[model samples]
Target: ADLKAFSKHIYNAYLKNFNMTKKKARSILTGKASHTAPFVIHDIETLWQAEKGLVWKQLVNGLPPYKEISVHVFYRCQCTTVETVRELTEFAKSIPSFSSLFLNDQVTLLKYGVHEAIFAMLASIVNKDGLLVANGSGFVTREFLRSLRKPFSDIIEPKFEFAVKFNALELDDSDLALFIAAIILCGDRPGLMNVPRVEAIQDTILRALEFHLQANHPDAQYLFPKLLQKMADLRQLVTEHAQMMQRIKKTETETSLHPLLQEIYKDMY
Candidate 1:
């Protein structure tokens, strides 16, 4: 009972940080409102020409930072991922059960599960065809996404598909808070120092999650199990995501993954 109360507090906290209500999210996704931007250049030609004045000649002798449109979007996407993970870490620490775990165990759980949580929340930012970028300031068309190199182009679309279906489940922010918490608090992460302890915490979270869902969505009898299934689906999606990351590291060496994300990838898989 105490945990449920704590869970609600945490959920409210999450809402304070990310207030993307359904109507607002849909508006951003559909481009119904013209979202103003800081600056987003979708063309490599313009970017490269602009770089002539912006970049130092010393920097280009070995290799220049990638100017490819896909790489630019990739960097922006990683920026989002890094910020999301940072916020999620704070969210996890807010939970009494999570903060009680060993520091190393806490890190392990976050390392393995952050991507899954990101994708689960991604339902809020995506539509059937494409997704909002630069925090809803820019929209990437499905056709433009498809124009990128093979595995690179392949990344965003699958996430879009999963998110579209996940959104159909109609989970509100309150439900998402508990679900993302459950994803991060799982016992199954590799290199856990205290498996039983982590599992115990996870079980409590799951129970809280189930109970909350039942109360919140009373008519949706299957929603709880369906959410569990979505978690499994998230696991698969992250697996493919990791594979794509590996491909990027091998094939697109000039396009860097953020150091923090690289660290997470190494620790996770």
Candidate 2:
């Protein structure tokens, strides 16, 4: 199988094999299907904790003194970011052409591009009410995020805003592979040893994305441009996010950002 073939490869790879994503939550949210036993495990509703109350304990207390709430929310968001980062690395191994690049370049690309891809995939796991958390063990509400105090409370709001806007293109699992692949293969990624090589690959990925819309959203004009715009918007969003993160790094001295996330943030900073 080639790229077109592998596009579907990533479709499922990104969509299905991704251990921590949305649709299973959707399956339970939309109707009744399977996922063992599903519940509308609201953020504050559950005293039944994920990591045995280590996950979101303060937030579950309903309102843990304003200062504590922000710290709790900050930790939860970092947990999601950490989980998504792992999902992304799992995806990198599944891309067939990833082997075309040298090992070091592959690491370089993931560093620059994972946040971009992370946010794109974030759209999948999120919905209007809120996003699935603890691997869909819970669905945290928008109001729940709003309940928190500053700095930490501010970080993830734009993603929900962005995800809702992004749904307009009607891209499903299929198109995501190409879009995310484009992110990784992007020639603009600094320190790549093979710029033209990646450029040609990126060129091919975009073509698939172009054609993908015809079948998926034939009526929507200027969609591909919007798609391109969405990618840039994500970059802008990530930079803005990194700005927030830098402050969190300095001021929020108690919590620990993941080592991988810390690495990614240092470069972005």
Best-fitting candidate, scored by TM-score: 2
What TM-score does prediction 2 earn?
0.84
How many times do residue backbones clash in model 2?
Answer: 0
Checking candidate 2 for backbone clashes, the offending pairs are none
Model 1 lDDT vs. the true structure? 0.75
Give the TM-scores of the predictions, in the order they appear.
0.83, 0.84
lDDT of 1 by residue, 58-81 (tens): 334233256766776577578778
lDDT of 2 by residue, 1-269 (tens): 25556566767777755765445555756657754533444555452454355444353444222345457666656666776777777777777677778888888888888888888877777778777776665567776776666776688788889887887666767788778888888787777898888788788778777877676778886888988988899889988888888888888776666676778877664
Off by over 4 Å in 1: 1-4, 19-24, 27-64
| Error of model 2, residue 266, in angstroms | 1.9
Instruction: For each candidate in turn, give its C-alpha RMSD to the true structure in angstroms.
Output: 4.8, 4.3
